[PDB]
Every structure is written in C-alpha cells, then in structure tokens.
Swiss-Prot record, chains A, B:
The gene is gliJ. GO terms for biological process: gliotoxin biosynthetic process; mycotoxin biosynthetic process; proteolysis; symbiont-mediated suppression of host immune response. Dipeptidase; part of the gene cluster that mediates the biosynthesis of gliotoxin, a member of the epipolythiodioxopiperazine (ETP) class of toxins characterized by a disulfide bridged cyclic dipeptide. The first step in gliotoxin biosynthesis is the condensation of serine and phenylalanine to form the cyclo-L-phenylalanyl-L-serine diketopiperazine (DKP) by the NRPS gliP. GliP is also able to produce the DKP cyclo-L-tryptophanyl-L-serine, suggesting that the substrate specificity of the first adenylation (A) domain in gliP is sufficiently relaxed to accommodate both L-Phe and L-Trp. The lineage of its organism: Eukaryota, Fungi, Dikarya, Ascomycota, Pezizomycotina. This is Dipeptidase gliJ. It comes from the Eukaryota. It comes from Aspergillus fumigatus (strain ATCC MYA-4609 / CBS 101355 / FGSC A1100 / Af293). It is an enzyme of class 3 (hydrolase). Pathway: Mycotoxin biosynthesis.
Length: 381, 381
C-alpha cells in the first residue's frame, strides 16, 4: 500500500515521540525491579502492552518513560509522603538499569539534541517523567535532584490532591486550582528547566498554570473534552490557553477518555481527537500520549506499542499533510523541550533566585555564640 | 624561606586533595541552605573553618565535600530513616548549587580525569561523599541514584549502628562488624564504582571490610591508634590489612584523635601520624583528611583551610621526600578513585548481577491473571 510505505518513510525521517508509558511500573509489578537474567522476558513479555521486540516493531522514535509511584495511602501522612520519595528513586533506578542493559535498543536522552543523536543511531530516545508532585515529598531540593537524575517533566498531580495542586478525579477541591506553594513552584520549574505536565490536574489548575507559566507546557496523556466529557480531558477554554502558552496536548489512548462505552473505543476515535485539536489550535500544538501500560486494554487498532504505524497511516488517510503528521509525531514535543531549556538558560543567566525548602534550626543560640567567638579568635592570629 | 617556596611549588605541581570537609552542613546550620545574596558571607564567613577566600589562600587542589546528615533520632524508626534520605538530597542540592554559583573557584569532579582537568583550570576539584549508610534509608536503589548525583564515597557508618555495619563510638555491638546485608553491599559498592570509607566504623567492621573488598578503600578522616588510643583511630592490624587492600588512610586533624588532652594538639602531632603510617605501610597509602567543620576548634597551626601550606612545609622539614609529599597531598587518593573505577568497569564488563531491594507485591493473583489473559488475546490478533 502507498499510504503504509508513506507512514514507514515518515517514521524513519523524524522520531515519533510518545508522551507517557508506564512500562517501568509493570517491571515493578511483575519482576519487582529485578531484571537480572530476564532479557528473554523483557523482549517478549508475558504481560502488558510494552516489550523490547514490539517496541522495535512499531518503529517508535522516542519515549518519555514514567517513573510513576502510587499516591500515598498510609494513615501516617509523613511516612506515606516520604515513602513515595524512596519508591520514586527505585523507579528511576530500574529505568536507568533497563536503558544501560539494552543499549542497542534504548539510549538515554534529556534534551532536544540528545533525542536527535539517539534517533540518528537507531535507538529509541529514552526520556523520563514523574507522575505527581506527591513523589517529591514536599522537597524542592529533591525536585532539583530528580532533574539531575534525568527527569524532564513533572505531572503536577496524579489522582490525589497535594500541597501544590488539585487532581481532576478527587472531590471536593482542596486549593481550587493551584495553591500558594504551587504558584511559586511554577516559577522554580521554569527556572530549573523542568517541563510542566498538566495531565491528571483539575480544569481550574490547568487554567491557572497556563496563565502563570513562562515556558510552554504539555499534557503528556489527555484527550478532548468537547468530543467526550471527562474530568481528565482538556476543555476548549484550556486548549485556547495552551495555544497562547505555545504548549502541546499529547492525545491519549485511554478508552474511557475516547468514548462513553469503553469497549467501543477505536483507532478512529484517537484520530478524531488529534484532528479536532489540530483544526482548532493548529497542528503545531498536538502530540501523541498513548498512556500504554497505564491501562489493561487499548482501543481497537491500538492494542500495544507495535501499532504506531497504523496511527501514522490513519492520519495521512484523513488528509493531514506530511509536515503536519511529522509535527504530531514528535517535532512539537521536541520544540517544547527546546523552549523549556532556552527559558531556563535565560532565567539562570539573569541570575534568578531559586526556591528553597523551609528547614528547621539545627543549632540553638549557645552553639551559634561558640562559633562566632571561635571565628574571632582565628581572626586575631 | 626555601622550604616555604618548595611547599608553594608542590601545591602548584599536584593537587592537595582533602578527604573530608563538612562546610555543606555549616551552610545548613547558618543559612539553612539559602545562599541567595550571601556571596559576601560565603567568601568571608562569620563562623566555621571554611570559606571561599581562605580556601583560595590555602592553595587546596581538591576536596571531598561531605553531604552528612545526623543519625536518625525519631522514636518512629521508619520516619527517621526516610527523613535522613530527604535531608541527604537537601545536602547534595546545596553542594551542587554552591559549586554552580561559584564556577571560578569550585568545579565539580567525579573521577581521576575530572580532578586533573579541574586542577589544570585552577579550580578546587569538588567531589562528594555521604557520611553513613543511614543516609540511604535501606535502599540500594537510592545508593545507585546518589552515585548518579555525583557521590563517590560512602562512609559505612557515622556514630550509630545501621543495618549494614557497626559504628565505633556506640556500645554494645549490633552485628559484631558487618551484617549479612553489609557483606553483600560491599560487592555492590565495588560493582557500581563507589569508594568505601571506613572512618567512624568499628575495628572489627574495618577488618572484615578490608578482607572482603575487591577494590581499594579509604579512611576519609581517621588517625593512628598506636600514637593515641581511640575507637576512631586505625590499629596496626587494620593498617596492615589496608596495605594488602591497596587503600589510603587520610590523617585527621581532630584534636581528640591526636592527643589525650585536646588543647595540647598541634600541627606536629598531625605530621607524627602521617610519618608513622608512611614509615610502616609506605607513603603511597597515606593521605590528608582534615575533617574541617566537623569540629569547633583545630590543632595549633591547623586552625582553618588556609593552613595547608604549613602542613606541606612541615612534612618536608621532617625529611619526607618531594615525591612522598606529593603522594600524601593527593596522588594516592587519585589512584584509589582510579582503581575503584577500573574494578567497577571490569565487573560491569563481565556482567555481574546488581543487588536489588526487597519490594512488596503490588498486584494480587487476580490482577496477574487479567494481565496474562489480556496478553494472549493480543497474541491471537
Ligand atoms: Fe502513568
Ligand atoms: Fe496517568
Ligand atoms: Fe563529617
Ligand atoms: Fe566525621
């Protein structure tokens, strides 16, 4: 078929970069992050929508791998918050080991340039995101260290309220959008060069974040509200504010977000949602955000990671131009990451003050007097 | 003076690399890790033994900056252990920000090659160590992520027992040296390329670690037992086992470790301890491990970081050769780090299995059956 050969050529020309895949959490579920001697199973998994053979088969160019851990469920709220931080380091650890043990398939990337060089080499560009600010345990210092470990986006919430923002699926609201701490964190996220992800956040939290952010943001896995009403889908108001922000909505394959009856969801529905967004806010602000392995079953025609060529062929078949399809595949998300880096370098170059954690005093006044007296004794020598 | 000009020439030829300095903890105590607009104070501190002006003045070539946090003091033992992990990320964060805000003075290094290139440029080579396995909150995954953040040594204990080893200053003993988990961690530390530090550990814990380690280790700040009996000083038995291990004892400036009366401790005592070790196990296994800012007051002649030229001149004055003084200054600790990297690359090249954390099951058998049934449905398509 000429349309299938066209799709194959496009997948070789530019990288298809998917916004969200929870394959690392499946490895925690199935292997408990012990991948020693499991190469055969990693290439041909007995569960889930992702493995290394099917990842090659679908011709995917890049992937933001999710370092998701669940919302804290402990009655002791201090323990649960701190537990999520330790679990986050476990998930980042298994992601890095997964990449390092399979360098012919996966190559780590943390920038627009590292995505391209990975793609030139024939590797799946392997980026990282965390899915909820509950994962940082109220520590902005921890956030900056997660950035140093390779994290390049932060979903502001999962399905739980935190100190910074409101999740979509939980009622009643806590902050009514972003908190006072949340507003201040947006500045710090822009300053450090961390891409903001608005999937899972409430409609009001999206509106406030889209006005306040000095860099373009993403929805790593969300769909369109006007086609299917859900708390997790993006309203026409927020799509318009995404346009002004210069961000990208990466369209989701979740069946519940594409149709009222989940078993009726299809490849065609995903293409409808892409075309809706592209028509109304331009094809330079739309992406692909599967959420593979964040679901049991996918839509008809998008059952696993091998099915990306069918999506590309489908978009071309509806009359979306090559240039616009290339944008949706990956160019748009690369641009956002590029702009997030440029804004961070500009703010860091101007010498903007970083956000610091509120720490307890470790010394009393007696200790501080001893230290000052000691310093002046040394000055006399 | 010809001996002072000789010392100045040596300090320019090779880097003096100090084993331990807790300046980052002083910044937590005094500033609470908020260094915004504090450059004037960072160059001329009102407290402590370290600042950026005196660091230049003493002609120090490199420094392992301590990311120390205190032993957990919480009655809830889960909270205290997890709290130490969050505090560790705060200390690593302020160390990185300290280096990034002062690039003319400090430059990050994580290897023998990065130490030299930093020294060629005229910067203080800025490395990182953590001071106690209580800082990892029982997570080997967290340990590997600390390595990725730039940590290049781990003191096995501070002044508290942990799941892996016994501290020197706490009685009674818990494990009687290393635990079963501790023995297994030694293999993982050698595999990942993390330098083992035996300061603060018990005499028996040192003996067991020195026999079991496949890479050379250090004492980042310890002194000689035969000259002054203390639980924190190295016995003649362990000095001999350090020789076989090919490790380095980095001599400490702590007054309590150099003399029975702390107020009698001097520069001469530090030189006595270096010469004792060098004479008995060779000058290629001795280093300098100040522990500046882990103490209120230093010995006479070693009051702060400006005093390193007096130590170098003092060693030359006692008849220690230039080549041997260069070794003590930094060549020895560079060699250990070099060998720790070479052993890690060899074991990683052979494909040795990494140590994994013991995780809870997140899925019950009903969820696992749904996932396998779903996988086989996809195989039928
Ligand atoms: Fe997810
Ligand atoms: Fe999700
Ligand atoms: Fe210390
Ligand atoms: Fe110490």
């Amino acid at each position: 078929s000429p349309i299938e050969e066209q799709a194959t050529r496009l997948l070789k020309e530019v990288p298809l970069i998917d916004g969200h895949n929870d394959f690392p959490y499946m490895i925690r579920g199935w292997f408990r992050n012990d991948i020693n001697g499991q190469d055969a199973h990693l290439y041909d998994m007995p569960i889930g929508q992702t493995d290394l053979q099917r990842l090659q088969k679908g011709l995917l160019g890049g992937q933001f791998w999710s370092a998701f851990v669940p919302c804290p469920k402990n009655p002791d709220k201090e323990v649960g918050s701190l537990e999520a931080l330790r679990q986050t380091l476990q998930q980042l650890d298994v992601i890095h080991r997964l990449i390092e043990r399979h360098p012919t398939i996966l190559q780590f990337a943390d920038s627009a340039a590292s995505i391209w060089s990975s793609f030139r080499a024939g590797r799946v560009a392997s980026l990282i995101g965390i899915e909820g600010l509950h994962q940082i345990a109220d520590s902005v210092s921890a956030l900056r260290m997660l950035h140093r470990l390779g994290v390049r986006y932060v979903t502001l919430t999962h399905n739980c309220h935190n100190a910074f923002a409101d999740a979509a699926t939980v009622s009643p609201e806590l902050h009514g959008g972003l908190s006072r701490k949340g507003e201040r964190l947006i500045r710090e996220l822009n300053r450090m060069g961390m891409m903001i992800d608005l999937s899972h956040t409430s409609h009001e939290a999206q509106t406030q974040a889209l006005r306040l952010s000095r860099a373009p943001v993403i929805y790593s896995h969300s769909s369109i509200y006007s086609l299917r009403a859900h708390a997790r889908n993006v309203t026409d108001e927020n799509l318009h504010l995404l346009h002004r922000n210069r961000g990208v909505v990466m369209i989701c394959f979740l069946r519940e977000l594409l149709a009222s009856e989940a078993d009726q969801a299809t490849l065609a529905h995903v293409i409808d949602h892409i075309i809706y967004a592209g028509t109304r806010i331009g094809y330079e602000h739309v992406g692909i955000g599967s959420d593979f392995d964040g679901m049991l079953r996918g839509p008809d025609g998008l059952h696993d990671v091998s099915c990306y060529p069918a999506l590309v062929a489908g978009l071309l078949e509806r009359g979306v131009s090559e240039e616009d399809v290339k944008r949706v595949m990956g160019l748009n998300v690369i641009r956002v990451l590029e702009e997030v880096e440029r804004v961070a370098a500009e703010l860091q170059g101007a010498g903007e003050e970083c956000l610091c954690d509120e720490l307890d005093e470790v010394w009393n006044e007696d200790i501080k007097e001893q230290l000052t007296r000691e310093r002046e004794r040394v000055r006399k020598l």
